[PDB]
Short mmCIF file of C-alpha atoms in Angstrom, two decimals:
data_model
loop_
_atom_site.label_atom_id
_atom_site.label_comp_id
_atom_site.label_asym_id
_atom_site.label_seq_id
_atom_site.Cartn_x
_atom_site.Cartn_y
_atom_site.Cartn_z
CA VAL A 1 33.44 -14.05 9.65
CA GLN A 2 31.47 -14.09 6.33
CA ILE A 3 29.14 -11.59 4.65
CA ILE A 4 26.65 -13.64 2.53
CA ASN A 5 24.01 -12.26 0.09
CA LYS A 6 22.22 -15.36 -1.45
CA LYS A 7 19.76 -13.00 -3.32
CA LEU A 8 17.22 -14.61 -5.70
CA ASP A 9 15.11 -12.15 -7.77
CA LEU A 10 12.12 -13.39 -9.84
CA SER A 11 10.19 -10.07 -9.55
CA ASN A 12 8.14 -8.76 -12.52
CA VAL A 13 7.42 -5.23 -13.83
CA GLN A 14 5.30 -4.69 -17.00
CA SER A 15 6.08 -1.00 -17.69
CA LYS A 16 8.91 0.76 -15.83
CA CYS A 17 9.84 4.47 -15.92
CA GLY A 18 12.59 6.24 -13.93
CA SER A 19 12.15 9.44 -11.87
CA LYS A 20 11.28 12.91 -13.32
CA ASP A 21 12.64 15.07 -10.47
CA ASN A 22 13.34 18.71 -11.50
CA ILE A 23 16.31 19.86 -9.32
CA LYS A 24 18.17 17.23 -7.33
CA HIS A 25 21.46 16.78 -5.39
CA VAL A 26 23.15 20.25 -5.39
CA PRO A 27 26.36 20.40 -3.23
CA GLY A 28 27.55 23.42 -5.31
CA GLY A 29 28.00 26.52 -3.12
CA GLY A 30 26.83 29.86 -4.66
CA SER A 31 25.41 28.00 -7.74
CA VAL A 32 22.03 28.62 -9.48
CA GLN A 33 19.59 26.05 -10.94
CA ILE A 34 16.41 27.02 -12.82
CA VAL A 35 13.83 24.69 -14.35
CA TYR A 36 11.34 26.93 -16.16
CA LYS A 37 7.82 25.71 -17.14
CA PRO A 38 8.59 21.91 -17.15
CA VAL A 39 5.60 19.74 -18.18
CA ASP A 40 5.01 15.97 -17.90
CA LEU A 41 2.38 14.92 -20.50
CA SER A 42 3.36 11.20 -20.77
CA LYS A 43 0.78 8.42 -21.29
CA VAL A 44 1.55 4.90 -19.92
CA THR A 45 -0.81 2.02 -20.85
CA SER A 46 -0.19 -1.50 -19.44
CA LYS A 47 -2.46 -4.45 -20.36
CA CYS A 48 -1.85 -8.03 -19.11
CA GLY A 49 -3.63 -11.41 -18.82
CA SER A 50 -1.66 -12.94 -15.92
CA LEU A 51 1.29 -11.16 -14.22
CA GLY A 52 3.11 -13.20 -11.58
CA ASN A 53 5.23 -16.18 -10.51
CA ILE A 54 4.11 -19.81 -9.90
CA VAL B 1 30.13 -13.63 13.27
CA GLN B 2 28.24 -13.82 9.94
CA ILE B 3 26.00 -11.28 8.19
CA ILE B 4 23.45 -13.28 6.09
CA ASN B 5 20.89 -11.65 3.73
CA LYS B 6 19.10 -14.65 1.99
CA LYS B 7 16.62 -12.28 0.14
CA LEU B 8 13.98 -13.91 -2.14
CA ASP B 9 11.96 -11.46 -4.31
CA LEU B 10 8.85 -12.63 -6.23
CA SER B 11 7.21 -9.15 -6.10
CA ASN B 12 5.03 -7.83 -8.96
CA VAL B 13 4.34 -4.28 -10.21
CA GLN B 14 2.20 -3.63 -13.34
CA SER B 15 3.16 0.02 -14.01
CA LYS B 16 6.00 1.68 -12.08
CA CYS B 17 7.00 5.38 -12.17
CA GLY B 18 9.75 7.01 -10.06
CA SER B 19 9.37 10.25 -8.06
CA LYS B 20 8.58 13.72 -9.51
CA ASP B 21 9.99 15.87 -6.68
CA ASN B 22 10.62 19.55 -7.56
CA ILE B 23 13.63 20.54 -5.35
CA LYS B 24 15.50 17.82 -3.48
CA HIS B 25 18.78 17.43 -1.49
CA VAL B 26 20.54 20.85 -1.47
CA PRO B 27 23.71 20.95 0.71
CA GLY B 28 25.00 23.93 -1.39
CA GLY B 29 25.43 27.05 0.79
CA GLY B 30 24.21 30.39 -0.68
CA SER B 31 22.80 28.54 -3.79
CA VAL B 32 19.44 29.27 -5.53
CA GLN B 33 16.96 26.70 -6.91
CA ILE B 34 13.85 27.82 -8.84
CA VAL B 35 11.26 25.47 -10.32
CA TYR B 36 8.87 27.84 -12.08
CA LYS B 37 5.31 26.61 -12.97
CA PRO B 38 6.01 22.81 -13.05
CA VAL B 39 2.99 20.74 -14.25
CA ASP B 40 2.22 16.99 -14.11
CA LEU B 41 -0.53 16.08 -16.66
CA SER B 42 0.57 12.42 -17.07
CA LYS B 43 -1.89 9.53 -17.50
CA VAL B 44 -1.30 5.97 -16.23
CA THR B 45 -3.68 3.14 -17.19
CA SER B 46 -3.13 -0.39 -15.82
CA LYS B 47 -5.41 -3.33 -16.72
CA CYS B 48 -4.85 -6.93 -15.56
CA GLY B 49 -6.74 -10.26 -15.32
CA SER B 50 -4.71 -11.84 -12.46
CA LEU B 51 -1.82 -10.09 -10.61
CA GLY B 52 -0.06 -12.18 -7.95
CA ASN B 53 2.01 -15.19 -6.89
CA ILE B 54 0.89 -18.85 -6.46
CA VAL C 1 27.39 -13.49 16.95
CA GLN C 2 25.33 -13.43 13.67
CA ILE C 3 23.06 -10.92 11.92
CA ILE C 4 20.45 -12.72 9.70
CA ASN C 5 17.78 -11.04 7.45
CA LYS C 6 16.01 -14.02 5.64
CA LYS C 7 13.50 -11.69 3.78
CA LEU C 8 10.82 -13.20 1.47
CA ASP C 9 8.93 -10.65 -0.70
CA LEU C 10 5.71 -11.72 -2.49
CA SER C 11 4.27 -8.14 -2.61
CA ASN C 12 1.97 -6.94 -5.42
CA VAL C 13 1.24 -3.34 -6.54
CA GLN C 14 -0.81 -2.60 -9.70
CA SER C 15 0.19 1.06 -10.32
CA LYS C 16 3.11 2.58 -8.37
CA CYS C 17 4.23 6.25 -8.44
CA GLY C 18 6.96 7.83 -6.25
CA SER C 19 6.66 11.08 -4.26
CA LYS C 20 5.89 14.55 -5.70
CA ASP C 21 7.39 16.64 -2.87
CA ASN C 22 7.94 20.35 -3.62
CA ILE C 23 10.97 21.23 -1.39
CA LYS C 24 12.83 18.50 0.45
CA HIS C 25 16.12 18.06 2.41
CA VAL C 26 17.98 21.45 2.43
CA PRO C 27 21.13 21.40 4.66
CA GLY C 28 22.58 24.40 2.69
CA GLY C 29 22.64 27.56 4.86
CA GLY C 30 21.81 30.95 3.24
CA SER C 31 20.30 29.14 0.16
CA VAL C 32 16.92 29.95 -1.51
CA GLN C 33 14.41 27.37 -2.85
CA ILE C 34 11.32 28.52 -4.77
CA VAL C 35 8.71 26.27 -6.33
CA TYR C 36 6.33 28.72 -8.01
CA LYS C 37 2.74 27.58 -8.83
CA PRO C 38 3.39 23.77 -9.00
CA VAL C 39 0.40 21.76 -10.36
CA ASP C 40 -0.54 18.06 -10.37
CA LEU C 41 -3.39 17.19 -12.79
CA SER C 42 -2.20 13.59 -13.43
CA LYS C 43 -4.59 10.62 -13.66
CA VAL C 44 -4.13 7.00 -12.48
CA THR C 45 -6.58 4.24 -13.50
CA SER C 46 -6.04 0.70 -12.18
CA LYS C 47 -8.34 -2.24 -13.05
CA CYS C 48 -7.78 -5.84 -11.90
CA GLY C 49 -9.77 -9.11 -11.81
CA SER C 50 -7.81 -10.82 -8.99
CA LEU C 51 -4.96 -9.12 -7.04
CA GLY C 52 -3.23 -11.18 -4.30
CA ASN C 53 -1.18 -14.25 -3.32
CA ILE C 54 -2.33 -17.91 -2.99
#
């Protein structure tokens, strides 16, 4: 009758960033959301010799 | 009767960014969402020797 | 009577970005969504020697 997970995670990420969504998840009736002139200018640089497992 | 997951994750990502969606998931009746002149100018550079497993 | 998943993930991605969808999932009746002059000018550079498994 069990639920069994047994999860093993050895995954690798060098550089990780979340989302940059503008307007997101609005249940609010009659509400107003404005995002005015948003800009993403970010620089991400990742340099690696070996990235992995085993 | 079991539910058995047994997940093994050795996955690799060098650079990871989330989504950049403008307007997303609006259940709100009569609501207003404006994203006005959104811009993505971002730069992603990824350099690797070996990326992998085994 | 079981459910069994048994997933093994060895996947590799060098550079990963999510979606950039403009308007997405609107159950809200009578609502207004405007994305006005959206722009993507972003740059992705990926360089690898060896990418794989085994």
